[PDB]
Design a protein around this nucleic acid. Structure first.
Ligand SMILES: [Mg+2]
Ligand SMILES: [Mg+2]
Ligand SMILES: [Mg+2]
Ligand SMILES: [Mg+2]
Ligand SMILES: [Mg+2]
Ligand SMILES: [Mg+2]
Ligand SMILES: [Mg+2]
Ligand SMILES: [Mg+2]
Ligand SMILES: [Mg+2]
Ligand SMILES: [Mg+2]
Ligand SMILES: [Mg+2]
Ligand SMILES: [Mg+2]
Ligand SMILES: [Mg+2]
Ligand SMILES: [Mg+2]
Ligand SMILES: [Mg+2]
Ligand SMILES: [Mg+2]
Ligand SMILES: [Mg+2]
Ligand SMILES: [Mg+2]
Ligand SMILES: [Mg+2]
Ligand SMILES: [Mg+2]
Ligand SMILES: [Mg+2]
Ligand SMILES: [Mg+2]
Ligand SMILES: [Mg+2]
Ligand SMILES: [Mg+2]
Ligand SMILES: [Mg+2]
Ligand SMILES: [Mg+2]
Ligand SMILES: [Mg+2]
Ligand SMILES: [Mg+2]
Ligand SMILES: [Mg+2]
Ligand SMILES: [Mg+2]
Ligand SMILES: [Mg+2]
Ligand SMILES: [Mg+2]
Ligand SMILES: [Mg+2]
Ligand SMILES: [Mg+2]
Ligand SMILES: [Mg+2]
Ligand SMILES: [Mg+2]
Ligand SMILES: [Mg+2]
Ligand SMILES: [Mg+2]
Ligand SMILES: [Mg+2]
Ligand SMILES: [Mg+2]
Ligand SMILES: [Mg+2]
Ligand SMILES: [Mg+2]
Ligand SMILES: [Mg+2]
Ligand SMILES: [Mg+2]
Ligand SMILES: [Mg+2]
Ligand SMILES: [Mg+2]
Ligand SMILES: [Mg+2]
Ligand SMILES: [Mg+2]
Ligand SMILES: [Mg+2]
Ligand SMILES: [Zn+2]
Lengths: 73, 117, 181, 69
RNA sequence: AAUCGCAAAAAGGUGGGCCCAGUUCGGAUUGGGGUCUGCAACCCGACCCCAUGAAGCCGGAAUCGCUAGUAAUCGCGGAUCAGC
RNA sequence: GGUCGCCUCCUAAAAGGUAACGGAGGCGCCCAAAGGUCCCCUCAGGCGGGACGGAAAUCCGCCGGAGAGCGCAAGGGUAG
RNA sequence: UCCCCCGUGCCCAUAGCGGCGUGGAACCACCCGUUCCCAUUCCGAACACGGAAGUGAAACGCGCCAGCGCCGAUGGUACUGGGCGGGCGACCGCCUGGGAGAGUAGGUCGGUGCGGGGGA
RNA sequence: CGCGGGGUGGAGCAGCCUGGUAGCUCGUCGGGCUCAUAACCCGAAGGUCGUCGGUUCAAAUCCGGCCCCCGCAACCA
RNA sequence: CGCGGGGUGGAGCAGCCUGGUAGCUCGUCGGGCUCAUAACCCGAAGGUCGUCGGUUCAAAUCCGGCCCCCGCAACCA
């Protein structure tokens, strides 16, 4: 289920975050964190040239959070 | 109401009038005429009660008609859907049975267009 | 009194047959009808024209007596209905006029319906009453084609002195009431 | 009887769709009928009508054999 | 095989019916019953008979073809190929 | 800031009455029928039955002493 | 005077619900008929009239049981008019006169007045 | 209470001259032209003229009464 | 806490005074235009109106309690 998701005119997603819920999820998506290069002739190509591009992705595990039960005398 | 299952269009001819019975088409209409010997092109009301009562029972007893016919048709789909044949699963999911292409059309089994993003 | 085939069938056949089956020790203990009540629940002509005033004519045509009106008990918003506003017809048939109804109903009217498969036997009340429904009023022969402007059904209700459905089912089945099982 | 708004109850002859002369009373004097108690299927016994055993279906379809064992 | 056959061209003419209606318009969908080709038509064939007779009463924004035997309309033939 | 007259209940200690910036609600109208009288009728609710009809529209049955109704707040009264 | 029925009061369920049997000579009811008086927001159901063939089925009358309902002591307590007592205090306690509610035992399927009709 | 003048279709409205003529704009619909929204040009629908009632051959145009909104100036124990 | 206003489709704002009836702009979705994007053009979706209650035949509309937001007040010592 996606959360934040800024579009990208065409196509994208220029930025998009998503909560992938389940079991063994972080275990198999651990190694995705990093830069992913892409080489191809893009859709946007004004002629016929192959264009290199990149996208950083970041997998972050589920963080059990908890604010302090207010103050304490 | 009236012969046979319900009343038939008294304005137009009798060979047409029979069609408007859930059980009779133009085919069995012609036959109902011949195996009763009645005038083909004479209007409904114009038929003498003598002509009427003879044709009344003739067709009631020969084939299945109206809710009686409908009954079997309904009963047919039941048994298909229960044994779980392919022709039954297609009824079960409300899709076209007689093997058509679903990627387009087949609207008449699907109803109106269920467009989503 | 009156020469009525049904009034006869009851007394000269059904009635002694009832005593044959259950055996009563008094002549009055033998079950018999008392009321036959018809109720077209129109209500469609609620805040609408007295289009029901034609349906009165249709109803009286069948019974041989004028039906009175019934009006709204409480008011209901969901039904587009204000209290007191008229919504239905009731006509009670006692004595001889009752018989003439059943004598015509059981004979002519009932079999003239769309796919008659026999009256539902479960539809029995409990303390000896039986109720059923009609969707069409042209079923009766007194009603013709142009006399009708729309299909108006009715809640036929027939009562009896019977202690239970056993006597009731028995009484009617001998009279001319078909059943499914 | 509150006579003054009720219809007449004339003696009615009723010729039915079987030659029947159903003797009774009614509001209409000469009314004719399509079907009556005297010939309806679900009225006079189990009857038959067209329906006998539901088509040739299905364990009795016949119209073929290839077994002798 | 200019011999024989596919082969009735269909619009057309004549005759008869239909009377402005979801209609004798429309033939989708479905039931039941069969014919053919193939080892074999469940997924997955074509055609025939019966019954069912849907949406549709001239189509928003938009858009296409074609200037003469052309456009529109009416059939027929073939390549493929057991079959469609 | 809140309140100011009138009404209902409680506070109020079993007559009446009784305070507080005590607890809770209403009123400033309405009806030519909602009034006078004679005559007849009896609820709400519950279960079972009932074409469209549903939780409930109108109808049947059985059950029911008042829990309905009595223009509107509440109390009292009220189907003899 | 004693029993039965009818009308009617009183007491206000110890009288009622439910179950069980019983009563038609009389009385009553249902019942029969819908011409007339009268009547139905439709129906002779109700109300009304003229009856008297049937019948105690229903209603009602009379008994019969205690499931429900209802009634419900004695004894004891709570509470309390009055009079005191103890404790720092919050609250307890004694004498005197009055005395529930609940619960237990148990009771109840009525009593009765006037009038009319009929019985011994 | 007393004076002043009005509804005319869906809103604004002369027709209220001087009684025989019910209009304009927008609105809405169809067509035109149109990259368009739009201006623009043709056609169409809707008026019972606040009510009952009176004069007239005929009156939304005149009167009697009255409904109603706005407008008028006083009064307010 | 003392008074006032407010909470309605993803954003912003009508509708509540007078009960029956969810509206505007933007956004989003589907189809056009264009080589493509935006503009533009055509069609659609999308809330049971903060929340518990009560009034009513019926509540976004009326009435009471709570939650959140906003402005005003908080003075003489
Ligand atoms: Mg971004
Ligand atoms: Mg960011
Ligand atoms: Mg007989
Ligand atoms: Mg009864
Ligand atoms: Mg021709
Ligand atoms: Mg087909
Ligand atoms: Mg057309
Ligand atoms: Mg002040
Ligand atoms: Mg008190
Ligand atoms: Mg006290
Ligand atoms: Mg005093
Ligand atoms: Mg009731
Ligand atoms: Mg009830
Ligand atoms: Mg029910
Ligand atoms: Mg529901
Ligand atoms: Mg009581
Ligand atoms: Mg109130
Ligand atoms: Mg009270
Ligand atoms: Mg004496
Ligand atoms: Mg016993
Ligand atoms: Mg006895
Ligand atoms: Mg007995
Ligand atoms: Mg005896
Ligand atoms: Mg006797
Ligand atoms: Mg005697
Ligand atoms: Mg009685
Ligand atoms: Mg006698
Ligand atoms: Mg006797
Ligand atoms: Mg005894
Ligand atoms: Mg004691
Ligand atoms: Mg002491
Ligand atoms: Mg001490
Ligand atoms: Mg202390
Ligand atoms: Mg102390
Ligand atoms: Mg203490
Ligand atoms: Mg103290
Ligand atoms: Mg003491
Ligand atoms: Mg006692
Ligand atoms: Mg306007
Ligand atoms: Mg004149
Ligand atoms: Mg004039
Ligand atoms: Mg103004
Ligand atoms: Mg918002
Ligand atoms: Mg573009
Ligand atoms: Mg959707
Ligand atoms: Mg949604
Ligand atoms: Mg609420
Ligand atoms: Mg509410
Ligand atoms: Mg309050
Ligand atoms: Zn017949």
């Amino acid at each position: 289920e996606i959360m934040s998701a800024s579009e990208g005119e065409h196509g994208g997603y220029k930025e998009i975050i998503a909560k992938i819920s389940g079991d063994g999820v972080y275990g198999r998506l651990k190694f995705e964190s990093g830069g992913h290069r892409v080489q191809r002739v893009p859709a946007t190509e004004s002629q016929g040239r192959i264009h290199t591009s990149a996208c950083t992705v970041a997998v972050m595990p589920e963080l059990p959070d908890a604010e302090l039960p207010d103050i304490n005398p | 109401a009236r012969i046979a299952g319900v009343e038939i269009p008294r304005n137009k001819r009798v060979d047409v009038a029979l069609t408007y019975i859930y059980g009779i088409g133009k085919a069995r209409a012609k036959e109902a005429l011949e195996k009763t010997g009645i005038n083909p092109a004479t209007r409904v009301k114009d038929l003498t009660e003598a002509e009427v009562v003879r044709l009344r029972e003739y067709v009631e007893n020969t084939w299945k008609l109206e809710g009686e016919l409908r009954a079997e048709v309904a009963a047919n789909i039941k048994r298909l859907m229960d044994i779980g044949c392919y022709r039954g699963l297609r009824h079960r999911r409300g899709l076209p049975v007689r093997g058509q292409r679903t990627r387009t059309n087949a609207r008449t089994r699907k109803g109106p267009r269920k467009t989503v993003a | 009194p009156l020469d009525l085939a049904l009034k006869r069938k009851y007394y000269e056949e059904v009635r002694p047959e009832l005593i044959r089956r259950f055996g009563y020790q008094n002549v009055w203990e033998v079950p018999r009808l008392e009321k036959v009540v018809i109720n077209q629940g129109l209500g469609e002509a609620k805040e609408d024209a007295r289009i029901l005033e034609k349906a009165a004519q249709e109803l009286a045509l069948i019974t041989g007596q004028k039906p009175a009106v019934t009006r709204a008990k409480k008011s209901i918003s969901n039904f587009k209905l204000r209290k007191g506003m008229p919504i239905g017809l009731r006509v009670t048939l006692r004595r001889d006029r009752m018989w003439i109804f059943l004598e015509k109903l059981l004979n002519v009217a009932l079999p003239r319906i769309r796919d008659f498969r026999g009256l539902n036997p479960n539809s029995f009340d409990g303390r000896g009453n039986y109720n059923l429904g009609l969707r069409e009023q042209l079923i009766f022969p007194e009603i013709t084609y142009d006399m009708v402007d729309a299909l108006r059904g009715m809640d036929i209700a027939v009562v009896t002195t019977a202690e239970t459905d056993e006597e009731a089912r028995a009484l009617l089945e001998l009279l001319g009431f078909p059943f499914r099982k | 009887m509150k006579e003054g708004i009720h219809p007449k109850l004339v003696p009615a002859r009723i010729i039915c769709g079987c030659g029947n002369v159903i003797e009774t009373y009614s509001t209409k004097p000469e009314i004719y009928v399509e079907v009556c108690s005297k010939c309806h299927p679900f009225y006079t016994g189990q009857q038959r009508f067209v329906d006998t055993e539901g088509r040739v279906e299905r364990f009795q379809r016949r119209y073929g054999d290839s077994y002798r064992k």
